[PDB]
């Protein structure tokens, strides 16, 4: 087509979605991790994670207001990944890299799994 | 902080939100324009438009599944703006620029209003 494109549009949209999350506006699901609860928007979770995409396209699960993650999932690793989904920023540290990678593998967040693998290979 | 950032994350999120819109997945509102109906996600509309932000933060309107726009709003101008919200791409043409600018002013989409003003000033 002959469209023009606003370079900062996608980043501005994500920033506003994160502001709605912070203020708990239109959040439609609670993710339960080892008795730690995280409120979010189903559509953002689906846009970022192959696991949430599969969960919320399921005819029965699409209607659930609570999702319980596998007990092996670490709440801090989840929290870091949830922050990444809404900001593009990943708080990756020596002390959390193993939990973050295991959580990203479970959530099916391929780009996060890739950078964790590379950061681990650099330390060996 | 000491975060790393994935450059393409925001664009990938928006692309996936547009794919959900195309497949009518988790759309939670119908926008009615001169008897033309557009399905969308309330959160994306709020992230892009000052008007939708004000509508869906209102305690009564946040719960509506149908929103009727002012009868002066042109469906094509709305359609072009809805596409912009989900893609960052604006199909701005000599034949639609007046309708697009009037719709962007009503929807409170300041960056769109700005480029329309500039494109009109160049033609005078």
């Amino acid at each position: 087509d002959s469209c023009i494109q606003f370079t900062r549009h996608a980043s501005d949209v994500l920033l506003n979605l994160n502001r709605l999350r912070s203020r708990d506006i239109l959040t439609d699901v609670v993710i339960v991790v080892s008795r730690e609860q995280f409120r979010a928007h189903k559509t953002v979770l689906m846009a970022c994670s192959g696991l949430f995409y599969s969960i919320f396209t399921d005819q029965l699960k699409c209607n659930l207001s609570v999702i319980n993650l596998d007990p092996e999932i670490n709440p801090e690793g989840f929290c870091i990944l949830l922050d990444f989904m809404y900001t593009s920023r990943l708080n990756l540290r020596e002390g959390n890299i193993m939990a973050v990678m295991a959580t990203a593998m479970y959530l099916q967040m391929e780009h996060v799994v890739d950078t964790c693998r590379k950061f681990i290979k650099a330390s060996e | 902080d000491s975060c790393i950032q994935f450059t393409r994350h925001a664009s990938d999120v928006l692309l996936n939100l547009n794919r959900l819109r195309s497949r009518d997945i988790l759309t939670d509102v119908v926008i009615v324009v001169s008897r033309e109906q557009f399905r969308a996600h309330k959160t994306v509309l709020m992230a892009c438009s000052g008007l939708f932000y004000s509508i869906f933060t209102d305690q009564l309107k946040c719960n509506l599944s149908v929103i009727n726009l002012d009868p002066e709003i042109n469906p094509e101008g709305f359609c072009i703006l809805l596409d912009f919200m989900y893609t960052s791409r604006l199909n701005l043409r000599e034949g639609n620029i007046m309708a697009v600018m009037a719709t962007a002013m009503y929807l409170q989409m300041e960056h769109v209003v700005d480029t329309c003003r500039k494109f009109i000033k160049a033609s005078e």
Partner: peptide, 4 residues
């Protein structure tokens, strides 16, 4: 704004 840019030409994509």
């Amino acid at each position: 704004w840019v030409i994509p």
